[PDB]
Amino acid sequence: KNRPNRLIVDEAINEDNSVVSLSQPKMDELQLFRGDTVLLKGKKRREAVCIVLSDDECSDEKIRMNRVVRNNLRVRLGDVISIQPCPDVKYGKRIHVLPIDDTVEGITGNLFEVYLKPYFLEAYRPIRKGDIFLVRGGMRAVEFKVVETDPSPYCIVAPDTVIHCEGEPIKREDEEESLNEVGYDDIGGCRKQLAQIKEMVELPLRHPALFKAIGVKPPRGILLYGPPGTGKTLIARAVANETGAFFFLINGPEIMSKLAGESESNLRKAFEEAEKNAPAIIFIDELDAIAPKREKTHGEVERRIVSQLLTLMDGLKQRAHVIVMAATNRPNSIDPALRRFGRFDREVDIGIPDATGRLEILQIHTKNMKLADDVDLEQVANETHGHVGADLAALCSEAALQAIRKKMDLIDLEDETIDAEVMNSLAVTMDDFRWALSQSNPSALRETVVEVPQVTWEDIGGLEDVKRELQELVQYPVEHPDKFLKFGMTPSKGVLFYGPPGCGKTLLAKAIANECQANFISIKGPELLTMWFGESEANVREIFDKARQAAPCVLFFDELDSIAKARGGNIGDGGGAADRVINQILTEMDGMSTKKNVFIIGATNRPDIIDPAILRPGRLDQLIYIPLPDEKSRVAILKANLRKSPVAKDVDLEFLAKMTNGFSGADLTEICQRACKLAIRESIESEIRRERERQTEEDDPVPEIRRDHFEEAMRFARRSVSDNDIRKYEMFAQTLQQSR
Amino acid sequence: NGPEIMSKLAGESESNLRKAFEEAEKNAPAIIFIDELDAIAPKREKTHGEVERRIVSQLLTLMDGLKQRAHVIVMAATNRPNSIDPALRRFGRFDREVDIGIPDATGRLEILQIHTKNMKLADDVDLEQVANETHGHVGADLAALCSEAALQAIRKKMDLIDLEDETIDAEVMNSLAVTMDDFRWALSQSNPSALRETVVEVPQVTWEDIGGLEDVKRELQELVQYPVEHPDKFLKFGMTPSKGVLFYGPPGCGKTLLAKAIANECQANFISIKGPELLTMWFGESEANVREIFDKARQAAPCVLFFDELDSIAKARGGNIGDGGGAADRVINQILTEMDGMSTKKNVFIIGATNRPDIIDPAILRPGRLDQLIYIPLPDEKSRVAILKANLRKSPVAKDVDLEFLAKMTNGFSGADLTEICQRACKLAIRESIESEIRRERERQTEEDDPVPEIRRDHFEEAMRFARRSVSDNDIRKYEMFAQTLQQSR
Numbered sequence A: 001k002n003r004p005n006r007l008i009v010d011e012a013i014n015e016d017n018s019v020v021s022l023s024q025p026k027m028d029e030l031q032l033f034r035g036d037t038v039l040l041k042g043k044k045r046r047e048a049v050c051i052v053l054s055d056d057e058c059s060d061e062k063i064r065m066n067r068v069v070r071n072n073l074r075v076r077l078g079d080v081i082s083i084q085p086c087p088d089v090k091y092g093k094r095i096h097v098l099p100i101d102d103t104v105e106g107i108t109g110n111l112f113e114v115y116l117k118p119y120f121l122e123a124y125r126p127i128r129k130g131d132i133f134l135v136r137g138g139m140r141a142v143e144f145k146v147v148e149t150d151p152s153p154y155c156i157v158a159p160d161t162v163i164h165c166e167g168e169p170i171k172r173e174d175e176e177e178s179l180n181e182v183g184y185d186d187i188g189g190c191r192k193q194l195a196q197i198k199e200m201v202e203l204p205l206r207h208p209a210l211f212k213a214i215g216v217k218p219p220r221g222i223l224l225y226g227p228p229g230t231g232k233t234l235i236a237r238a239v240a241n242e243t244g245a246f247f248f249l250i251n252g253p254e255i256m257s258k259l260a261g262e263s264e265s266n267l268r269k270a271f272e273e274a275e276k277n278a279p280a281i282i283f284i285d286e287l288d289a290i291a292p293k294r295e296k297t298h299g300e301v302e303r304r305i306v307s308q309l310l311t312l313m314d315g316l317k318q319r320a321h322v323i324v325m326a327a328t329n330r331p332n333s334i335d336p337a338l339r340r341f342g343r344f345d346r347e348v349d350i351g352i353p354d355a356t357g358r359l360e361i362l363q364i365h366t367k368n369m370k371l372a373d374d375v376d377l378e379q380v381a382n383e384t385h386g387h388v389g390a391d392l393a394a395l396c397s398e399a400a401l402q403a404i405r406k407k408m409d410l411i412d413l414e415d416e417t418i419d420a421e422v423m424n425s426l427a428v429t430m431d432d433f434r435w436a437l438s439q440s441n442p443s444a445l446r447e448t449v450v451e452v453p454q455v456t457w458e459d460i461g462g463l464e465d466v467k468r469e470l471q472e473l474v475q476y477p478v479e480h481p482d483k484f485l486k487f488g489m490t491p492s493k494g495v496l497f498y499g500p501p502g503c504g505k506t507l508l509a510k511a512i513a514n515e516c517q518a519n520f521i522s523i524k525g526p527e528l529l530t531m532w533f534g535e536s537e538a539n540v541r542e543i544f545d546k547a548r549q550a551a552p553c554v555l556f557f558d559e560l561d562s563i564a565k566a567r568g569g570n571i572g573d574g575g576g577a578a579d580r581v582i583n584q585i586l587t588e589m590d591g592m593s594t595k596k597n598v599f600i601i602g603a604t605n606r607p608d609i610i611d612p613a614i615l616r617p618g619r620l621d622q623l624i625y626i627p628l629p630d631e632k633s634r635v636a637i638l639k640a641n642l643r644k645s646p647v648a649k650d651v652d653l654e655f656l657a658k659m660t661n662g663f664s665g666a667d668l669t670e671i672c673q674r675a676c677k678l679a680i681r682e683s684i685e686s687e688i689r690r691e692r693e694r695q696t697e698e699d700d701p702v703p704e705i706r707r708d709h710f711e712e713a714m715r716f717a718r719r720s721v722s723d724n725d726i727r728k729y730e731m732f733a734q735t736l737q738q739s740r
Numbered sequence B: 001n002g003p004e005i006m007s008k009l010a011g012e013s014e015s016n017l018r019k020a021f022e023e024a025e026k027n028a029p030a031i032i033f034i035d036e037l038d039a040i041a042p043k044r045e046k047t048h049g050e051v052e053r054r055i056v057s058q059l060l061t062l063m064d065g066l067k068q069r070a071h072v073i074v075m076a077a078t079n080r081p082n083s084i085d086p087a088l089r090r091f092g093r094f095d096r097e098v099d100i101g102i103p104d105a106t107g108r109l110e111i112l113q114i115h116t117k118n119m120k121l122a123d124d125v126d127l128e129q130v131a132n133e134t135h136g137h138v139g140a141d142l143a144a145l146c147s148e149a150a151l152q153a154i155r156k157k158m159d160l161i162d163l164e165d166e167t168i169d170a171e172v173m174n175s176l177a178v179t180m181d182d183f184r185w186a187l188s189q190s191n192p193s194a195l196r197e198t199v200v201e202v203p204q205v206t207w208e209d210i211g212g213l214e215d216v217k218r219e220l221q222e223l224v225q226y227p228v229e230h231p232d233k234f235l236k237f238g239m240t241p242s243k244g245v246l247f248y249g250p251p252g253c254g255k256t257l258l259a260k261a262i263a264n265e266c267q268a269n270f271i272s273i274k275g276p277e278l279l280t281m282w283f284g285e286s287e288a289n290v291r292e293i294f295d296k297a298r299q300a301a302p303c304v305l306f307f308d309e310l311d312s313i314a315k316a317r318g319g320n321i322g323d324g325g326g327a328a329d330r331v332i333n334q335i336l337t338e339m340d341g342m343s344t345k346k347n348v349f350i351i352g353a354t355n356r357p358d359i360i361d362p363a364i365l366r367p368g369r370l371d372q373l374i375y376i377p378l379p380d381e382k383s384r385v386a387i388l389k390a391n392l393r394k395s396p397v398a399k400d401v402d403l404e405f406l407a408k409m410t411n412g413f414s415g416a417d418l419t420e421i422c423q424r425a426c427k428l429a430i431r432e433s434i435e436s437e438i439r440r441e442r443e444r445q446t447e448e449d450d451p452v453p454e455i456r457r458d459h460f461e462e463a464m465r466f467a468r469r470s471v472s473d474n475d476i477r478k479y480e481m482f483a484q485t486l487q488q489s490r
């Protein structure tokens, strides 16, 4: 018809297996309501009946499409479908649905009331003939095929019908695949990297003939890496099985497990077999087993194997319908002659996930688990700092095995055997989650983390003008390069905080990285000391390579004065005013691109004994005095700390605010900690006294703090900063020369 | 190709190399090409097995045994000259040496002119922008950049517009152009810059970019430009020319600009070495790098070699008291030893620079070495107005503003201070203009009458309220000691 009814498929955000979400101007163009019965026609004359729903997440012309119904239509991602309303659907009297025997194995008991009757209630579901849907439960996920309906050829189902499920399972026909093949639905986290790998490879695989009409070379050597266990083979096979090409898998240890000429014949026949079924993808994992760093290679057959791989990958420039993906452990653990132009050009890091990614990975792995009601995935989302996803698979399987181990093993073996009806009753508790998270958790990470921070501007009290002109200093030229191009001034890229210790030096950097949606990689002082004492400075280049790879980002140096204080004070050691790591930092600083959005933030508390070679233009040049807090900042900081804890309202904090002057913010965030420790000790002792009183039940004495704890904490209080350091810093206010 | 010859067995590789040289003998005249020589003949210490030395000896015999023939010629290509076996590049085997090097902005413009030949650009695309904004790239990155922008123009418009209705032909490929937005997008992300090493190019700053300092410029022109054009006069009067010059002065007086102007006017290459390079060669105790630098310098003939912050190695191990040592170090005497052992006429002219002329080693002030001393003083008011206009020529400024008030007020100021105060005022003006822009946007709309494209007296007055001198008086007296005393030989 060539009208807007020809639409492009996508992934779905909805979690029902038969609903389709669409946008508002599109749905106002088609004149429907919510919950209408809609019909989809695609390729090879297949049909889909669905419920339509409305969402603003959809764009102008796309369709949020589920995987089981897109495999029901026998189409894939990148195909076009046709949309028609079918508003004349009645109810049925008999429903014929039956499994395929290849996915129901080990199963005993009745199948009908355990799955079908928990499914076909309360959801009027549109079913057409020959359809295969998918349900979960029983620690499993089973698909189901329908055969016959009374209102031919489709109906909507309701509580007011029956389903006749009689018969034996039927073998799967030759055309479709199973649904235990992995896909785009079961990879939690790292959505941007998946989008980048999706957009980089879509054209020569979905439209191969276009590059048979245009001679422009696509990128063919694309290399992803990451710390191990993160499922690089999983995402590789997911992209290859989702976009629909021929797959073949070369693993490094198997090729090293043969003789010499047998390995040569294996690699040659593998590349010929990948040539035969074009278009196709090819995958080499554990490249460290095949082509290591050259200094770590000692024999003779290994260099011959690496030269064989170089000739075999240079000799497929003529072909353009295969593409090579590979996976190592680290980019510094490959031979440097391999990753060059014509062999391996594109580079992508997977990285470790974060709390949102951990929540999504946990949402993947409790899909067919049948949780309880008291289990709280936000708890084990926030309490699981520093983990990879295979540890999360181990954690979920460990909690499931603990629920099998405590109740229902010895309860059942004394009387009967085990079926799936009692597997329906099995849920797991949060106690097994806390038990599997307390012990038996080998945390597989000690390295540097990269994430967006969470502290916002309202978490720090006051300091308002400094926040707004820092916002001027970073936020402006990334949004308006035309004004700077008009006035010809290149922007500065350095800023140097300084101030007395204990004034909240990390919080403003966290707020700037959180508001502009920037990554964050921090380096403390102890990292500088363990890079100085070991005399190892081939690590700074790795840090700034990671920084450029995490573009955009803000790089935070904490305790820069440690290397100048460590070898003596202001007299110092026998040396002078320079060192090793700081000039290595300058040399790797000034030799990079101006527009790459890597913004370097330094910090110290001793601004006099620092090397003045860092205050050159083109480097760190912006100085901001961070002073002691004032009383309005004191009440603001005190409320911003006390917002987490339950406090009383009759207590008054302006007495101590008007009393305490010249105090660090760290002191006024530890005195509340001291008072709350005193209150928690008082409450637990009154708890054990009322327990031992009549019983040798819960009327809580107080959930908050009174004036007594604050008065005793002020009797335990202490200032942290002397007056002479304030005069040493106000020397810079009196003198004002700060260029060099 | 090297990897293919290493991909066989031993006698098969021998038969392959022998049949290759016989086949190159058959169709004389012909050329022959061996790339990735690092795969065939590496450095000898990195070779460990047995068949590799046999292969290298086979190559040496096979190239010595074609001296009788004269109708073939061998060209080869490695990665680095320090990564070949040293027994290979000798007389009778490999005599001539030529560096390709990295291109520059003119070369980048020409390479981009190569790769948009059949591209059908738009009208708004500006190749000068991505010529000047692409510092530090090789040409394969430029091929990747042009193909990436073309793939982005295929990815945004015309993929999903076309697949919903019809198929793809070339009549719609005629309508396809690319925009500059895809160029900025492919240049912002997905640009692995493949270079960190030293660059060699002609500079662009001319004599009019620095204000005043006229007599010093003309007798420096006497010092460098004269004997390359008139060797007959020096041969007549028998004096060999000096080849060293030592700038010195207080910090912040434009020390790099005169060196850039001399290298730009006489059409000379330029290789500079800052102070941090001297510190990372001293602390690591690695001095097999100076010889590489002067080999690159002789290979870049003619050129001018610039040392910046020479006083870093004398200040780094203590001040004028120093460390436990004395008045010498390691890198500077290595510099002297590689300096005096080279040809007089090779047009390698060495320019040194410091800001502390007293604590430097006086062994460098010998004849046949750096001997010419030029006091670079503080700017004067005519140099102040000249330097201020030479900085402000880039920015749009108003004409009713007057700069001679602050010029007659500011005395004893560095040129760096009077090129950052304009930067501070223009940051203040760009903040004022962007806030008035967002206020007029949020005023009636919650269209473009520009309030001001230039600077008024208010920004300069506030920048003078934020102004600061950078040099004290006692350092001027410490330098004018050399004017009062005048002994400067050793």
Ligand SMILES: Nc1ncnc2c1ncn2[C@@H]1O[C@H](COP(=O)(O)OP(=O)(O)NP(=O)(O)O)[C@@H](O)[C@H]1O
Pocket (backbone or CB within 6 Å): A459, A460, A461, A500, A501, A502, A503, A504, A505, A506, A507, A637, A640, A664, A665, A666, A669
């Ligand atoms: N509102 C606040 N005001 C001040 N400090 C705060 C505030 N909120 C949190 N902090 C604490 O301040 C820390 C930031 O370090 P900061 O206290 O400024 O350095 P420092 O204490 O002066 N030097 P040091 O403690 O030895 O590393 C954070 O880690 C918090 O523990």
Ligand SMILES: Nc1ncnc2c1ncn2[C@@H]1O[C@H](COP(=O)(O)OP(=O)(O)NP(=O)(O)O)[C@@H](O)[C@H]1O
Pocket (backbone or CB within 6 Å): A616, A617, A740, B209, B210, B211, B250, B251, B252, B253, B254, B255, B256, B257, B387, B390, B414, B415, B416, B419
């Ligand atoms: N007309 C000018 N007069 C003075 N300085 C200028 C002028 N034009 C540019 N400059 C700046 O002067 C710099 C040259 O270094 P220079 O300022 O002489 O060394 P220095 O500032 O005294 N010592 P340092 O800044 O610590 O490396 C250039 O990089 C420019 O930023």
Ligand SMILES: Nc1ncnc2c1ncn2[C@@H]1O[C@H](COP(=O)(O)OP(=O)(O)O)[C@@H](O)[C@H]1O
Pocket (backbone or CB within 6 Å): A186, A187, A188, A189, A228, A229, A230, A231, A232, A233, A234, A361, A364, A388, A389, A390, A391, A393
């Ligand atoms: N983010 C994740 N999503 C889904 N599964 C994961 C994830 N991370 C780890 N896994 C599981 O951990 C295992 C590790 O992946 P694998 O391909 O074996 O990596 P490697 O071979 O490098 O250890 C996989 O079998 C996968 O099922």
Ligand SMILES: Nc1ncnc2c1ncn2[C@@H]1O[C@H](COP(=O)(O)OP(=O)(O)O)[C@@H](O)[C@H]1O
Pocket (backbone or CB within 6 Å): A340, A341, A342, B111, B114, B138, B139, B140, B141, B143
């Ligand atoms: N200056 C240039 N002019 C034209 N093409 C270039 C240029 N630089 C790089 N290329 C492209 O980059 C690729 C790299 O050249 P190549 O011969 O493969 O070098 P190597 O094998 O040493 O990487 C070539 O295919 C070439 O088309």
